């Protein structure tokens, strides 16, 4: 039999420290190619190794396809085959779109159905996983409505996290790293401050706050760990909850809800799976 | 141009399958995992990132996949293919001279001091199932080493040991000692080395009994072929090697031939069952270049 392996790479839709990602085509269909920077060889291997160890298959999860390393002359070229989703990551999304409170909700339940999908151990199944870089860039939008979430070199089952996300206990070296418990909890901060940045762009009564980043009040661009270690261990900053928000009862519950993922304290912080929960009883 | 066309399958096991395939109007060799042996994929696709491994006598790399759908997976090695087959294969069907003989040994000695050797880059690599069947014979004489799926990597430069993840063990009939009685020292690296060195031995007696002396020639037998039941267990193993501290018989034509002598003597010194007594790989690759 024939087997079919060229890629026809079109359009590059992301560039950074980690490589590339293209807009690709594989048999009449799009597919997005993640090509590694020797700088990010191990992002690729742990994502490998974690699907070589479980399959996921979640509509909240961005879709494996391929991982191929390939031999060069003087180099090893890595790829990460994906499904492609046209709308892009939420970050980009949300520069240029306000959201209603159906498509606000749709957005949140969607990525905390996923993160719960991660953290959920099942007997059989799959292993218990932590993401360890959660961002509005690492989900992609779908065109139903719903999110997905990318990204998984950092993942661990049972390079550091994005500075500006990370928790107070990963930021004071507290961190209890024997611990599993202890990476869901980073995601759950994470997840927090994802949360923060959708609600600000759900209209309410004619008003909407303008896209911005996490802490964009208190850190330069491209903080610092000690910029982000002041703010969030020394000083206890949190996002800011706008005053309209107290006028919607969505986005009341919202402010509720992220204050209960942004305790100093890990174990005080909501879980994904109770997080979905009170999403399903707003509105 | 990446497609690949498989034109027919040259083995099948428990370690999944082999193709010949066409890849740009070329042969390649196409492995295709079993699911039982998911980590042996990976460990070789770490070898193989490494591009300072690419060497004469070692199984040169093209590419490696791991695809899915749904809940299939399937896991892909793609090589250079030598139609000739395997060291086990060819010798089964073919005598030796004295310069073809050393060849082939010199060639796999040269693959195995060039793993076990530390380029500072390679780490130092120990295989862990080396075996005829795991050696390819090449249209110029020589052999390379396949299957890295147990390898062990070690760097002395940052004292690092990666031993990997991967329960499945060697091939019984090539274990040493201390592989059958569970003794080795994991945390070792120059242990894994050892394991190579026993094994080397064997493969060494396997080809060296197809050399033709004075008219003689032994058949082709595996290691061990006289003392243990047909498909071999571990314990079946551990009582010759371990109880009954059998090692492989030296044919007495060999003593009347020079080169056979010198190579009954370096097989010996790869199977004592004190691991540190045994030779290295660098010290049987310079023993081999100055037999004949
Ligand atoms: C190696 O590399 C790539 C391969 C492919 C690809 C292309 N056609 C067919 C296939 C295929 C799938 C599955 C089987 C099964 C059939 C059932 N049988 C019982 C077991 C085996 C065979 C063939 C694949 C996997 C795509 C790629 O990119 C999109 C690859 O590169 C990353
Ligand atoms: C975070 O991580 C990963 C993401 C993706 C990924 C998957 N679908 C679509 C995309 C994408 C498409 C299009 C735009 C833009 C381009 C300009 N204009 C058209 C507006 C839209 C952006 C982004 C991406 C980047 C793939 C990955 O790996 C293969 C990722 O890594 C795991
Ligand atoms: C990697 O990705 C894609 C792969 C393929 C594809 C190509 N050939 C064959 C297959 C296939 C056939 C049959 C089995 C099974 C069926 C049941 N039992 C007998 C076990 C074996 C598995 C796999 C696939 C899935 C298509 C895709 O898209 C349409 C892929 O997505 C980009
Ligand atoms: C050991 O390991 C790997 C080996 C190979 C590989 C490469 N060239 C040629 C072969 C071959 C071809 C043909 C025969 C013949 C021998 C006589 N008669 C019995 C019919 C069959 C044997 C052997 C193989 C098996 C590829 C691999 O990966 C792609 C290997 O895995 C690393």
């Known amino acids: 039999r024939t087997v079919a392996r060229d890629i026809t790479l079109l359009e590059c839709v992301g560039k950074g420290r980690y490589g590339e990602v293209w807009r690709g085509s594989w048999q009449g269909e799009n597919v997005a190619v993640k090509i590694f920077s020797s700088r990010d060889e191990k992002s690729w291997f742990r994502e490998t190794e974690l699907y070589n160890t479980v399959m996921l298959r979640h509509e909240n999860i961005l879709g494996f396809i391929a991982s191929d390393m390939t031999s060069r002359h003087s180099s090893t070229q890595l790829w990460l085959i994906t499904h492609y989703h046209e709308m892009g990551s939420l970050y980009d999304y949300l520069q240029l779109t306000t959201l209603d409170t159906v498509s606000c909700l749709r957005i949140v339940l969607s990525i905390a159905s996923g993160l719960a999908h991660l953290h959920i151990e099942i007997f059989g199944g799959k292993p218990a996983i932590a993401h360890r870089d959660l961002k509005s860039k690492n989900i992609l939008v779908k065109k139903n409505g719903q999110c997905c979430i990318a990204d ?132």
């Open 152 to 283: 998984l070199g950092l993942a661990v089952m049972h390079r550091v996290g994005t500075k500006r996300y990370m928790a107070p206990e990963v930021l004071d070296e507290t961190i209890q790293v024997d611990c599993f418990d202890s990476y869901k909890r980073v995601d759950i901060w994470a997840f927090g401050l994802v949360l923060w940045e959708v609600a600000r762009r759900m209209v309410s009564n004619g008003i909407v706050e303008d896209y911005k980043p996490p802490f964009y009040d208190v850190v330069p661009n491209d903080p610092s760990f000690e910029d982000m270690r002041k703010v969030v261990c020394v000083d206890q900053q949190r996002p800011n909850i706008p005053n309209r928000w107290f006028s919607d009862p969505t986005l009341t519950s919202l402010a509720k809800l992220m204050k209960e993922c942004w305790y100093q304290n890990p174990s005080a912080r909501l879980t994904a799976l109770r997080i979905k929960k009170t999403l399903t009883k707003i509105d």
